[PDB]
């Protein structure tokens, strides 16, 4: 996906302020709360009975950290997302059989979490740049379906 230099600037500047220990878990937890069918893939994580249970679940926070790491890796390789996400695509498509619509949903939940954390700093043009990114990541993660 192609970002303008202005968009790249907006994206990288904000990402440097992201709490990498917390934001991924917040996005994954909210995915599980807001789109409850996604809990089907996380039965081994234990207590997901309430939103508080989900957000406080240590496995959700830990796994969220891995997801965010993958988004960070995508931001470093915006011109080669397919190669970057190849192993993850095989995992999520060939092994897990997650419907790729959910890749889009998690990306949009991440965008909501960034808006939550950054407030007015998450301007409409900053959002538009991040939408290009999370769409790129979703399309690359879905490559094994294509």
């Amino acid at each position: 996906v192609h970002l303008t230099p202005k968009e790249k600037s907006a994206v990288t500047a904000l990402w440097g302020k992201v709490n990498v220990d917390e934001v991924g878990g917040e996005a994954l937890g909210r995915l599980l709360v807001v789109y409850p069918w996604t809990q089907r893939f996380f039965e081994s994580f234990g207590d997901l009975s309430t939103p508080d249970a989900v957000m406080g679940n240590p496995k959700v926070k830990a796994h969220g950290k891995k997801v965010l790491g993958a988004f960070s890796d995508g931001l470093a390789h915006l011109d080669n997302l397919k190669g970057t996400f190849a192993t993850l695509s095989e995992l999520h498509c060939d092994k897990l059989h997650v419907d790729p619509e959910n890749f889009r949903l998690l990306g949009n939940v991440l965008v909501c979490v960034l808006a939550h954390h950054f407030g007015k700093e998450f301007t409409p043009p900053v959002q538009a740049a991040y939408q290009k990114v999370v769409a790129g990541v979703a399309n690359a993660l879905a490559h094994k379906y294509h």
């Binding site: 957000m55 909501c112 407030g119 998450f122 409409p124 043009p125 959002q127 538009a128």
Partner: protein, 141 residues
């Protein structure tokens, strides 16, 4: 279906919006136009640039419709019937676009109401906007 807790959460969160209702609606439209440029083609008679009086005025209309839906949350098909006819028949709005505006409304609320936008309230607001979208896409003919 919206649960009792969902209705309570949506009323509470929307209550915090206040006199910013129109402003937040306008910001959600702007977010949608910039993020999802396909949606711009529905507004050729609008200048969609920042600070556009037309987008500001339209944001207020959008907000007023959402406020109507909150106030009549148990009777939304009836309350939004005229708006459903408009969007589906006259304007022929693609149903995908409601998901896009709903997402931009969530992002706008998250950016402005950090205390209100808990995971539970995020879930309730998503269900509410999906319910609104279901009504507004119910009249395709």
């Amino acid at each position: 279906v919206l649960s009792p807790a969902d209705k309570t959460n949506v009323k509470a969160a929307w209550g915090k919006v206040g006199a910013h209702a129109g402003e937040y609606g306008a910001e959600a439209l702007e977010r949608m136009f910039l993020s999802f440029p396909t949606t711009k083609t529905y507004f050729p008679h609008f200048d969609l640039s920042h600070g556009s009086a037309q987008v500001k005025g339209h944001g207020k209309k959008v907000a007023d419709a959402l406020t109507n839906a909150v106030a009549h949350v148990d009777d939304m098909p009836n309350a939004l019937s005229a708006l459903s006819d408009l969007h589906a028949h006259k304007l022929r709005v693609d149903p995908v676009n409601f998901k896009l505006l709903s997402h931009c409304l969530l992002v706008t609320l998250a950016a402005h109401l950090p205390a209100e936008f808990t995971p539970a309230v995020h879930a309730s607001l998503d269900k509410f906007l999906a319910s609104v979208s279901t009504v507004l896409t119910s009249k395709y003919r």
